[model samples]
Target chain A: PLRLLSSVHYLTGELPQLYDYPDDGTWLRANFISSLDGGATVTSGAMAGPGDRFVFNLLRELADVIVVGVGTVRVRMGVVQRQHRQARGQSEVPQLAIVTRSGRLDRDMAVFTRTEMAPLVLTTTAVADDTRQRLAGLAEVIACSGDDPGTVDEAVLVSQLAARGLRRILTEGGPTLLGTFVERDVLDELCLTIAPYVVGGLARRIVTGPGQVLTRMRCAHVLTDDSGYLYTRYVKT
Target chain B: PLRLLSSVHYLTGELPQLYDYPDDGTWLRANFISSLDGGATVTSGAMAGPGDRFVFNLLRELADVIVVGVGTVRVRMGVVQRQHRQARGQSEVPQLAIVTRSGRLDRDMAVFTRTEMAPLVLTTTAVADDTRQRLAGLAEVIACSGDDPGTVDEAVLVSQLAARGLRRILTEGGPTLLGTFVERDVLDELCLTIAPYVVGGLARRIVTGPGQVLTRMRCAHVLTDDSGYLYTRYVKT
Candidate 1:
């Protein structure tokens, strides 16, 4: 059992389960950390601490695929290590799915080389040939843009992941990519960790971008840590 | 006493106190509500519920004067009423101070007409001469942009308010006004309410504007209501 200090509760050793899978077997959940003032980060990268770290690992441990925006993947490379044993005879650890509008990514990043599972790259045909060629051998670059010219459609990307029998998806975001899922209304749940700090100024909110995507959610759970951090789970109702 | 659902605590009838006031007697606080996705609003304007309302009252009850941006005043007109009885013969309730750049507000708005205490309007000299003259009769319209051409310098405005013994300041903002204070480093505290819904879109955050103002704060308290709203208090460290 994992003891939570502030809430006076213990989570079972098995990672806490979220909502059941939909008929399509795809249940997309997002995990993010923000300061008390609703800022995701101050400097350019992860601003989570020990309390947030605990929940972060828990979310990844229970997922079949860990999907991340390219910017996040760059910042958090080599952090995904196999933690929990898989069910249903799935021997391998969760695969890494990198979503990018441009196919440009460092082929030598630890995300592509350090894990037993192959990384899946989602991008569009609008990317330059040199960019695609760089990631070609290292990862499976799936064309999510299809006939469209610009960015990959979020709905199409989810469909493609489900088609590959990868249903349990955890999106560790950089906001913009998560904005797409929120915009498309495909996100099933959000597990947020509120770090016990107030970050003022130009730090962006967790979900930001073009267009309004209003998705109402129901709180599944609210937990706290002795460090004064708040962890909340909101399921799409 | 007010019951809190989380951390097994209750705030006494008196407003729960935070950090001690600074030696300079210039303590500035801000209050804002945001969605679970870190969005301050979705359709339009501020969206807060019962739990947020509770803390909002608590903050105002403890403060000597409540300051607000013009836009926030428009949305939350007439809501501020005399609540807690005062001590040391300070029998009058809190004063509502509205900060506006344009000085264009409806004279008959509840903020001006409904409250027992007269509202204080802070605007720039750039505003029309008639604008200040119109409010001069009903409200104490202070010219914050005395020598400046356009905007009210946040530091100067706070100093002017401080000179009037309105030190226990609470700035309930419309983002832009709060951004100025945050950018200028005059804000002393931040009380945030996280509603249990996801407002995904191009929604504005609680603090939004140009330039990066990175202020570190320590968590003073974390409280939750049964309605799935998270109320947190942070003080400048």
Candidate 2:
């Protein structure tokens, strides 16, 4: 069983109460898991216990839209708990938003055909018109470009999602996309899971690419389970 | 003050009791501090609070030998508590051991002249004899090599240090050295401090230049202070 470790006067609490966020706010939260030695994916699946998977599904159930990079589209598109969403007055399931610059997504991908709702494809204005036409009946494709050429500006992406009333944004990143969000100073919260395994490899960290940006964050909470995993939450100071 | 979070029967305890180790065994423990986004050094000092520094010094006091790579020799070498070591029946301070392939350390470096005891220089036999001669009086130079042509084999390095009666070894790494130790499966324990900061940069992780090796570990303890830094200890299972 998971136990509350920080930000609480007591050692135990309801999981929903511990993770409660304000219902009305434009917040962007990113979640990721890494090995103890800092390999993002080398042994994540092997080391992750049941508690981690439970928290992962719980977070997705609480989000208005789940955002991810094109490289991470291979992730499973599962249905959320209907009762959990209905009690919170949310939709039956969270919408999926994929960010890609080339706008070249395969219609046969499971992400397009397996979900209960049509996914949103966020791309740049530099994408070919034929590519947009090809994705017409499959998904709602939006161009989110700013001053950057042939790239989706993170600020524009956030604003466009907010405009669509998808305020509670959750990004399950593939490193490069998270790096851009961090560099753009648009991320509001981070939920990180440290798995108990020493995966020594050349695997990249949760944030990658150039240009240094040090953003100080405050620890919101720290939790642990008997299975030896650390779940930590941090919010922008 | 720091509070015990995981692997404890209670929520609070004595710092020394929380970090206690058996007095008789050959243990190689590595200590490192990293940002929440996994940058090893980009914001370590900025995000590290007083508790982290206290644990850093306490771990040094508990070690028989403090080892590090040549690139990290700029770290401070300080005298330990006299009564603390005396009560434990250990030396006044832990010996400093520098691992280098070139054996070309500067005589004017603080690590050479600033300590109460002379340090040990562990280098490969491929190093120039003149370089060894230049470091004769400043430090004890030992050649540790194996099947690896120009690099010191990690297995041989451990046995050599253990032969010197330095059983409780502590390694403060520069990423590359830690990667080698992890790959060699010589690391027995890991004390990791997760600082509260999201440093988005091209900074390397705590393990670099590595062939993937997944070694499972068990969490010995997890602690957190009011300043929001996490102290986690893991031991080989």
The lDDT leader among the candidates is 2
Q: Where does the lowest 10-residue lDDT sum fall in candidate 1 chain A? A: A1-10
Docking class of 1: acceptable
Determine the iRMS, in angstroms, of model 1: 7.4
| Stretches > 4 Å off in candidate 2 | A1-13, A74-80, A128-131, A147-150, B1-13, B74-80, B126-131, B147-150
Chain A TM-score across all models, in listed order: 0.81, 0.88
Fnat per model, in the order shown? 0.40, 0.52
Candidate 2 reaches a DockQ of: 0.45
Clashing pairs in 1: A213-B200
lDDT string for model 2 (B17-124, tens) is 656666776789999988888788763576667888888878887888888989878634354465676678777778888999888898888888778777888888
> What is the C-alpha lDDT profile of model 1 across B1-237, one tens digit per residue?
111124444544333544234555778988888887778776233466665676676666666678888877651323233322344233357778898888887778878777766788888877747676787667887777756848888877887788888877887887877778877787878887777777675887777777464566766666665566666677776
- Reference-based TM-score, model 2: 0.90
Clashes of 1: 1
Compute DockQ for each candidate against the true complex: 0.31, 0.45
Instruction: Report the C-alpha displacement of residue B207, candidate 1, in angstroms.
Output: 0.9
| Highest TM-score model number | 2
**Deviation in Å, model 1, residue A220 alpha carbon:** 3.0
TM, every model? 0.78, 0.90
Q: Where is model 1 more than 4 Å wrong at Cα?
A: A1-25, A43-46, A71-83, A86-92, A100-117, A123-136, A143-156, B1-26, B43-46, B74-83, B86-93, B100-117, B123-135, B143-156
